[PDB]
Amino acid sequence: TSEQWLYWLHLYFWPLLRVLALISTAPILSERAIPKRVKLGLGIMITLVIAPSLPANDTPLFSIAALWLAMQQILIGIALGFTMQFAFAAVRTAGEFIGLQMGLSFATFVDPGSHLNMPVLARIMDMLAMLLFLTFNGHLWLISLLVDTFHTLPIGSNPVNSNAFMALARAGGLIFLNGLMLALPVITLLLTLNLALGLLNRMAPQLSIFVIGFPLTLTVGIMLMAALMPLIAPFCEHLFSEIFNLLADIVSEMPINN
Amino acid sequence: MTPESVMMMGTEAMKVALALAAPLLLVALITGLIISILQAATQINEMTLSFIPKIVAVFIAIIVAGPWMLNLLLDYVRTLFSNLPYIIG
Amino acid sequence: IALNDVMADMQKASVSMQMGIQVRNKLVAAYQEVMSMQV
Amino acid sequence: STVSFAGQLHAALDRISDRQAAARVQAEKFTLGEPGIALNDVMADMQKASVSMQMGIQVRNKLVAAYQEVMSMQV
Amino acid sequence: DRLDAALRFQQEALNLRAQRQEILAANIANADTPGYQARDIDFASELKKVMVRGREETGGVALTLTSSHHIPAQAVSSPAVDLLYRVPDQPSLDGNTVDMDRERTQFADNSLKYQMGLTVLGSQLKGMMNVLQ
Amino acid sequence: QFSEQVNYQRALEGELARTIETLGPVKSARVHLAMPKPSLFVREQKSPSASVTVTLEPGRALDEGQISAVVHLVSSAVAGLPPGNVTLVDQSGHLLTQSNDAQLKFANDVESRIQRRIEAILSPIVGNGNVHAQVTAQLDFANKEQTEEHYSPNGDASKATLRSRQLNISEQVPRSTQRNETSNYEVDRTIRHTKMNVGDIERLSVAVVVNYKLPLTADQMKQIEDLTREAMGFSDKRGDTLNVVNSPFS
Amino acid sequence: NDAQLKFANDVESRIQRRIEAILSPIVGNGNVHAQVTAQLDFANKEQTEEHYSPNGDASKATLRSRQLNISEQVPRSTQRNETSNYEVDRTIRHTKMNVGDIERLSVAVVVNYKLPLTADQMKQIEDLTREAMGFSDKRGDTLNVVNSPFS
Amino acid sequence: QFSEQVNYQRALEGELARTIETLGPVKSARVHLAMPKPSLFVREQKSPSASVTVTLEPGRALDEGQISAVVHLVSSAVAGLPPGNVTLVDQSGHLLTQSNDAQLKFANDVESRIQRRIEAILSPIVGNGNVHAQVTAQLDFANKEQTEEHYSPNGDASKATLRSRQLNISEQVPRSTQRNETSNYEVDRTIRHTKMNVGDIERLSVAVVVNYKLPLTADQMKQIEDLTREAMGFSDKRGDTLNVVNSPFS
Amino acid sequence: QFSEQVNYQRALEGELARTIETLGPVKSARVHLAMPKPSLFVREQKSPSASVTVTLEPGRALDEGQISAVVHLVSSAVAGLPPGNVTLVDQSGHLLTQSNDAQLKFANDVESRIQRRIEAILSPIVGNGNVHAQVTAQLDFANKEQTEEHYSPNGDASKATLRSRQLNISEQVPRSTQRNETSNYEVDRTIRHTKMNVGDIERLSVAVVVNYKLPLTADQMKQIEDLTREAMGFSDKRGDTLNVVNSPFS
Amino acid sequence: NDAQLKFANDVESRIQRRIEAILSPIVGNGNVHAQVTAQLDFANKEQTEEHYSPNGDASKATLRSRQLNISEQVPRSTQRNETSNYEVDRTIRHTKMNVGDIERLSVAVVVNYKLPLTADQMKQIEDLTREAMGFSDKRGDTLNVVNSPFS
Amino acid sequence: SWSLSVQTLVFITSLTFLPAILLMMTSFTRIIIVFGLLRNALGTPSAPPNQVLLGLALFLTFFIMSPVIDKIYVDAYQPFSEQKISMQEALDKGAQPLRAFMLRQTREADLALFARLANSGPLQGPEAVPMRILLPAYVTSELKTAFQIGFTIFIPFLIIDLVIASVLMALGMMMVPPATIALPFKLMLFVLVDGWQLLMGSLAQSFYS
């Protein structure tokens, strides 16, 4: 219990720091609903299971010259959790743009301090994707990849290489790509509807989409997205797997590149 | 809870929304369409001539539909909260 | 082990853990202050 | 094999308890009239046991302070 | 580190004070044995030696650390400090050169300076803890 | 999204069929898959499987060689499927997967190997059909583990290997003597981790009958006996038994 | 559950067919009949053994550490403390016995006549069948041969 | 965005089919891949696999070299595909992949090798068909691990190595003497980690029969005996056994 | 947005096809790369691979040189592909790559060099064909490491090096004399770090036979033997062996 | 797996052809036939040898530090406090023994007649083939060469 | 044993660990997370967290654990009091009920992850999992279950947002802020359906199924 331990209690601190970074940044782990004590205790109580079989020996220098080590762990956590947010942003884009088609957002068109559309359709699909994530192996693969980072990039004087934050920067990237690739059928069908009801204006310029168009397009959008709700379930697979691969890639890109 | 069940409940949400908002959107569309058909044939028009008809239409719609859409929504929400213990697994 | 050695070790480790925790607190606060701005 | 520092704390507590129990049974035996045991030996062992017990109390205080501090980092 | 490089001096000094303390109590305990030849150490020179060199305690070996149930035992260990003879006054026919008054005034002095070292370490550590809160 | 994977299934068992009918004596192949889940975590667990049915050559069936061909084909076709699961059924019953009698086949094979070898080594001496032998082999089908941790005895300091030795000698001459000797040793070691092989022969019992030319001579019989002892690989440490007789055949 | 019966049946058939195949050349195509009865151990067995070696003799012990103290004064007062930490040779096995191993045979053989067979000729026959069954005495195996005109 | 991988596979399958087609004895190679899944449930990641159905040239059969060739094509074409998982099936069954009993095929291999060596060496002595030998070989299929940690003995200070030594020597003159000596050594150390090979020969038993020219002379027999001892690689410490006899054939 | 990397891979596939085809004894070559995956669970990151189906020109066969050439072409065309794994197969089996035995060819090469050297030297003496030699080479293929940290002994003060010296001397005059001394040295140190080459000749066995001109004279033979010793690089410390004889040829 | 046997073939075949080619000039193209058996070690062996050098002979030891105190009074009482720390010469090899190496050879050679060969003409064959088969008498390599009429 | 020696030092530190570990190891994470998410819906919080939701969650978790607490009491406190059990078998006697309760609630895949990363071998049965494995699996499973419940609770209130926004847009009420209109409708959605009783009852039922 002395420093014969209490500097071997320096075995817990760095892995705890990395696990805590991931928890504070991860998609499900870092939700404001969880009491802060639960997240902290989960970090401590994961590292206690992972800390043995982690041969770590460093020093919390006074006026830390090894804070650049602490940085390292924090950064790796930011790598793992935050990137997994891209998969949600995608749908939080897709569904949002779907509203931007029907009628829901003409307040956001010509000008304000109130957006009012984030509550409407983006939070439908984003929490639907929340559940799709969790239902696997959602909560867990992030933690397993964190342990894998412990084993591939444990603790070192060369923590992070350049040319490797572009990977995450131009990664999304696939935020726009996948948001589209999901919302494309709905957008295309409502484009057809909008152009058709516009062509009605050729027979009579009085038909006034404000009067005719919006009630039609709202029903079309609601019914159609009801019909194309299940299409998300396969897409989320993609939407997570590829991003995992990216993380996996960078996690396994870093050791052979160091 | 399997992805099949989460998609089922999501589509159930979309269809309860459709049932609850269908009469109102429907009556708005019918009223606007009638006023636009009559809009020509003495094509006189200023901008709308149609908003106030839509308000009276949705007023009648909320009254005549009224209880049944509220009951449909209540049935949906009570059934969801009652099956909450069982959707976990 | 010497007793004074044990208490000096106690206190050194306690101060080191306090310093590490305070540094992490500052960094986490900075992260959240950066993430709570408008874009 | 493994250290499992909760096991180390258990070992420390067992050491403290065993030392106090030994001092107590020595005082037992001496006041009972058992020949052998001397008075200065009894008092010296009681003194050492007291010091070890205050050792344990101080370790308790600082561990509780440390835990109450690690539960304050915001996450 | 740089936490145990600033507190190192007082830690070493206080440990050396404790070591001189049991040297002096060995002087006291052997007050009336014949031919004892009271011992003592030079604190300033030994402290400089400790800071420059380290601990390097001479003489001590524990048993090995095999599977449990192998009865740990240890050899007789002694700090590397070179014990110096105390120059005696008043020869006493039995070689015992332990003068109560000298040994006892040194005991009181050493006790007081050990307490001073404890106060200095306590002050430095309280300062560290006051910075960090 | 519930159809895409089921479409994948009803595509791939069908395409496994259209592989299987390209096997010769395969007329109709209908196959099915099973992947329940990889999740049951107490010390036990449970596995996936697949089942097959086949229609054969009119008037011809499949021997166990064909069974092994189709079994490994299917198993290495669909991932997550050891060959132990696959069920094989004729176009009329006849289980071709017992899913603990493969050991019987293995024992018969070993007996056949050694028996044919004996006949081959004795045909030149006696002729083609003047000799007959049959073998019974005891086989170890128990899983054997072992971890031997031999060490070397360093009771002798001439071969002991010390890491540390503290030694105090102190004596006065009324001769008061004292001696202390603390020693830490370094020890030689060997760790033989072993996994003895399943299906090994542990006892052989070989019987031989040889025909007359008129009876054979004592040398003529002792040397045949020696040769069969040699060719069965007779090792006495197993308690193997060998019997030979000469008697006119039918 | 029943598969054990079919398995034991096949084993019996194997042994008895081997017996017939050996004894038909000796006596004729159908002058011999044998029936083999096998008891099988279908009870799952598990085991773990960890023999140690005896290091009572110091000349073959292996010492990790040894503290030895020797004292004496001469009114001869001696003392001798020796703390000795040993290292032990060790061997460990983990058997998982085969289910369905043969445990006992009881085999009766009948042979037709030519006139009764000669004693030596018959003793050869019985020794051949003992050989072919793989007769192991420790298993309690049992064998019984008779000669009599058939029907 | 799921049909792309299935289409990829149903295209690569025909790709590999056509590659196998351009090989001579192939008229249809219907093939199956199995890239299982990223298991988050169990931490070993069982490797992918592949099975092949091949239709040979009618009346042309593949010597095992061709089997190895196709195994390696399939294995190295599919990413991260170990060749152990590649399965081959003929147009009529008959696994070209043996993947429990290959031990016996291996045993017959070794025995045939030694047998052919004996016959080849002894034929010039006695003629093409006046000699026969049969070999029964014992093979060790148990997996053997080992770690020896030899230390050299430093009992002799004339050959020991010291990192530190503290030595107190005293004596008063009625003589009162003392000696203290602490020593820390450094030890010569050899660490073998030998993984013994599987399938290794442990005991050969060779029986040899020679025809007559009328029997052979003692020297002519003994030199042939020496020759077969040489050709069997007779290692007596293995317990190898050899027996040779001469007698007329049929 | 998945078929584009696939399309790159399959276009580069045709690329290597057209290249490796324009090589003389090639009529087709269907190639297939294998980039395993940027996987999800481990660090080992299994290496990529390749497979080649080449159809030779009828009546033409491949030396090893063209095999190495095409293997290198394939490996060097693909970024991040090891040359070892590149499997290479003909149009009818014959895995002409070695996808463990390169030792044998390399040993044969060293032997060929030395044998050609000995023939070249002895040829002007005895003629073109009045001499022959064969060389058996033992090669060391074990991976070798070593790290030596020789020190210079500073036991002698005449050649030692002092960083500091404490020296306390006292004496009384009944004479009490005291001499304490502390020494710290700076020690000369030599550190070799060697990785011995793998593929070194460790024992040569050279046998030479020479024709008769009639026997050659004693000097005429010893000088030939010395020339053989010279050209084989005969060093006794390697345990090399040499033997030369003279006799009629046939 | 079985590639071990193929490799054994390749090695023994190269040796065989070497003896054949080296003895053919001596006796004729087909007058000699030889078979060779190869004993291979397909075991993976690695090693970590750590020879130190003995610094017991203080004339060749290398000291980093030395505390030496010498005291005596003259009824003589002498004391000698001597504490030394060393630096030690050291070699650390890492041999990773090659897989597939030859450990023992068996060479059997048969030679035709011209009438059997004379003694010297055969001892030269003995020694020449011994040379050609890489004879290492440490390996237990064995040679057996005999003369006889062929068929 | 211990003799009013280290006892009453271990007891007081046990009391120290009470609030955090023993309320984050049993229940009261799932309930409190569900309440927090429910307050995320229904617009504004308007329920005094530090007092009412916390108190209701604490009472509800006490009612849930009355059987587990009863079994721990009956098999530890009555025997630990003065006779045949004292802080040595007290621990496992009090742990078995809590282990059974925690195992009955764990998602079956979290144990897999934490056994596969703790390098522990195959586990024969339900009991074979230890505390070092059981705790992180239980907290992960509790988080998963809490969020499944909480998002299923959101879905109807976002349905209300959808319908009201779409109706306002259909009427052309250009940029009337639909959240303000939705909030009272969310409130009657949550009170006509008898919201608080149904929610508390569903949580209690789900928490032993």
Side-chain angles (χ1 to χ4, degrees), chain F residues 132 206-212 215-216 221 241-249, chain G residues 18-19 22-27 32 109 111 117-133 135 143-147:
Chain F
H132 297 87
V206 162
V208 181
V209 294
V210 295
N211 199 333
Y212 280 0
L216 268 48
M221 185 75 147
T241 313
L242 165 74
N243 183 5
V244 188
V245 298
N246 188 5
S247 52
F249 291 3
Chain G
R18 185 175 312 125
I19 298 284
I22 290 284
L23 263 57
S24 309
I26 301 299
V27 304
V32 57
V109 187
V111 294
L117 270 296
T118 76
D120 291 331
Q121 192 157 351
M122 174 62 89
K123 181 266 290 180
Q124 302 171 342
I125 296 195
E126 74 85 21
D127 186 74
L128 269 292
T129 186
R130 175 176 277 106
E131 188 68 28
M133 65 164 41
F135 181 98
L143 185 147
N144 189 354
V145 193
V146 298
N147 199 9

Side-chain angles (χ1 to χ4, degrees), chain D residues 28-40:
Chain D
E28 179 76 27
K29 276 191 254 214
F30 180 62
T31 177
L32 214 58
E34 169 80 9
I37 304 96
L39 183 50
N40 58 6

